Amino acid sequence: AIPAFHPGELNVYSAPGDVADVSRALRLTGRRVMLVPTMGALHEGHLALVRAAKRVPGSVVVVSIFVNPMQTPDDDLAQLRAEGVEIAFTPTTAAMYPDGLRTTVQPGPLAAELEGGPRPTHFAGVLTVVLKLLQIVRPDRVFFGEKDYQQLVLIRQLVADFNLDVAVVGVPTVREADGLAMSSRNRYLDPAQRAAAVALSAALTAAAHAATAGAQAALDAARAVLDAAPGVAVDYLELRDIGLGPMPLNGSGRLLVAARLGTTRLLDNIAIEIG
Amino acid sequence: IPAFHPGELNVYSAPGDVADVSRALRLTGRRVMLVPTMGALHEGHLALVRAAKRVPGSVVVVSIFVNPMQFGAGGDLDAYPRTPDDDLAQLRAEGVEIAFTPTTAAMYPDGLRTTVQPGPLAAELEGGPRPTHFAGVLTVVLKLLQIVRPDRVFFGEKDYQQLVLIRQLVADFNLDVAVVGVPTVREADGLAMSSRNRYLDPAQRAAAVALSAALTAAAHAATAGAQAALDAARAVLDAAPGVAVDYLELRDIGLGPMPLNGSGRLLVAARLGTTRLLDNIAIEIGT
């Protein structure tokens, strides 16, 4: 007996078993199931993921809201209802981990670099939960922001390596008017910090344009912009190929930066074409 | 979809081919059964095939893939029995419609990268001196389940620790598959069927009956408690020539962080010359 699903309405499920049943039932009636995993506290970046999912013809949008211990509820639900989303999946920690921590995903060596330097088991947690969510919902496509680019690349590796049957859709970073990448962390910045934070996106965009003049020009331009900001402690600034291997001589790449402003760690990244 | 001819053995090497065929069969109302194997098929494997066949409306997929990732040294890997002609002939005789025989390059085109890390059971018993062994098994089994997407997957109780680890895999990753354990098939004297039995010379084959004798002796001794069951098994192993015991352990049926109660599993590993044999049996304690 399938749990109740009311079409055109926000249906909220906490039991993984229930959302599994509704998703399968929906797949069998011609819906294309789109998954948008979130950690709640939704903002415009999250709504951009929702909107991208919503525009696939015959889509039903599943938004998961799960605070992963290994990696405003009513506010959030009203936004989704406002976006015309039909399923929120809101499971408990116990429901996700009924046997506690046991079998897990071990990321490849990319997980040890960049963000995996300050947080070396962060990515295992993320990939473990994403794999679980994929298996519960069995979506046709799953949506992630390019904001967390290294995470996104690790998810693409998960999907490839485990032969998962889902398309991974990366959605361009939603930005404030001055270019700052949207993030929940942005609200912790004092005005001096928030004005200085603009150096991350400014550096990366300056780098993307300088790149007609080569990889070195691109990197030196980004470094100059970051060097013009006070109180911006750069953790890394790295040019890599699109899959985060070493940057090819010329061609397509990604430039990633991370910096601490007071106690707030900020990240950004951008597409780079070399020459 | 590639060609699929019902009532005939259809052999696919490309993951995409078997995946497409499987999905199309499921969408037609057939139930897809998977029996993951490392080839060198013997009567133990045919029991799994038979169990799968008797699921009504089943189409049966047997995979044959000697998985490098669950082997320690390349030495082990090169020595593994490969008899693919006997394998396919046995599958034909059993009425299996799909054999899935992937290449190493197709399964691991990027080498080792994202893997499954099993829970702490993978470090005990067989996993003790082989710390990456069960990671290798769970990784390839996860991949096979995702490629084939079966309704049910069949594993022998012979490799009992493996079966338990697969059940954990399936629970913890929320996989939508039923795991079916099939009772150990035995030779007339009680010897558990195994691809390793071929390495026993005549003396060794004679001595090897001691494992199953010891376990069945234990299961009946167990009315007198755990110590009696254990000491019965040990006496029988000790009375056998050229049988070096590696472990003999009585655990809970889940083999887990839980004390043995009424129902347990008695597990043995022993060396005959260079050949390492395993067996295990259900044990009820104080009956």
Ligand SMILES: COc1ccc2c(c1)cc(CNS(=O)(=O)c1cc3ccccc3o1)n2CC(=O)O
């Ligand atoms: C499209 O424009 C943007 C811009 C910034 C964005 C996003 C989109 C999305 C995010 C954060 N990712 S998430 O909360 O949806 C998430 C949920 C989840 C669940 C399980 C595992 C990993 C998971 O990751 N951010 C940045 C941020 O909020 O810091």
